[PDB]
Design a protein around this ligand. Structure first.
Ligand SMILES: COc1cc(C(=O)c2cc(O)cc(F)c2)cc([N+](=O)[O-])c1O
Ligand SMILES: COc1cc(C(=O)c2cc(O)cc(F)c2)cc([N+](=O)[O-])c1O
Lengths: 116, 116, 116, 116
């Protein structure tokens, strides 16, 4: 599993469950092609998005539908979504965890890159 | 000043100076059209992007070119940029401050929204 | 103003107003002695805590009473307070801004340090 | 495992490894009694701090020695440490994860509380 997404709720102190996540790769045409998506589990995590064969170097975008999450809780949010855009670079066996911590008017995101 | 952007550097404990910022507005045909741009000052602030008359209801995207900032400091960061997408003035006109706190592999963004 | 504290509310997208802030300095006998206190203004800022003459080298603790803030809003938060402990002026006198961004189960704190 | 601590490095995009963590409980005398400590693993995590029998309701402090971590990397940091102070409340089977994301001049901390 070369790419995992984890989403946390800073208002409830809980995993953010049932959040839609979409992953795009930048094409040679310089446009966003979708290629993976899912919803976060009870633990706030989304696994199995891609494989080591498919997850080649390139520019990637991870979109997290935070607005629908806050609306589901009856909280009016600021952002339409959280967007994380990054370059995947090969330099050894690497796994990427994209974490996002959500509040109605703020989010944080960090990348944890590790060699198994 | 209905829209202001402030950027801070979490590694140096300083404003993030001379950071490029681009603002887009979603058009009728669901394309992003350029709206304003500038660079952060010595205080990390970018003022004067727009006016109350031109900052109409809409969906806006603020792109902060964090990658060029970290590269100017010798650091190869994770993200291509920090992005904030939001609906503006949906309840009449306000004052929006978009703040970003930057680290090489992480950023936060917050909105402080006050009544004019 | 060598020391300023700014507090933001990540749930409401607003300054955190009327938040109690206490500053301590570590004494010769390794006890914390009270140094200054105040409440954040309508802008979320607390100025005038100390002077350049009294803000000598030392170890300082800034306690932000986040729990009473969230409780005034009807929210039972996780943390008792947000705390920042740092060594000050170890390289001559500077200007310190301590910023805190608050959520019920999370907070961030940052220091922006500028030369006088 | 009712209490786990996880520490992340926002500059390197990695777990923060070998970070000292100390846990204190507030005594009836209103003073901090130490009762658990350790160092974060290769995954940035510290498990086995306490048991369900010992982790009773009370006020707890988790101290994370961030200054020694940054010094070990040759980076001059702002904070002496990160301190998380909270009330543990019984209301069903609860597990607490205290997460901290570290930068030299900033840290974030969040609590993830879950029912297994
Ligand atoms: C709106 O004005 C400001 C906003 C902010 C933040 O949003 C902020 C973001 C964080 O991740 C953590 C934090 F503690 C503060 C920081 C400063 N500052 O430091 O000067 C401001 O003037
Ligand atoms: C490595 O994976 C994780 C990453 C993260 C964060 O990104 C994070 C973001 C913040 O603004 C503050 C913070 F303290 C942590 C949180 C948890 N967690 O809570 O379990 C993780 O397992």
């Amino acid at each position: 599993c070369p790419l995992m997404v984890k989403v946390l709720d800073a208002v409830r102190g809980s995993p953010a469950i049932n959040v839609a996540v979409h992953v795009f790769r930048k094409a040679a045409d310089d446009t966003w092609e979708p290629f993976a998506s899912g919803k976060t589990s009870e633990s706030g995590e989304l696994h199995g998005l891609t494989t080591e064969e498919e997850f080649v170097e390139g520019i990637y975008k991870v979109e997290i539908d935070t607005k629908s999450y806050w609306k589901a809780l009856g909280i009016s949010p600021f952002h339409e979504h959280a967007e994380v855009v990054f370059t995947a670079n090969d330099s050894g066996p690497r796994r990427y965890t994209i974490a996002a911590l959500l509040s109605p008017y703020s989010y944080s995101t960090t990348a944890v890159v590790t060699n198994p």
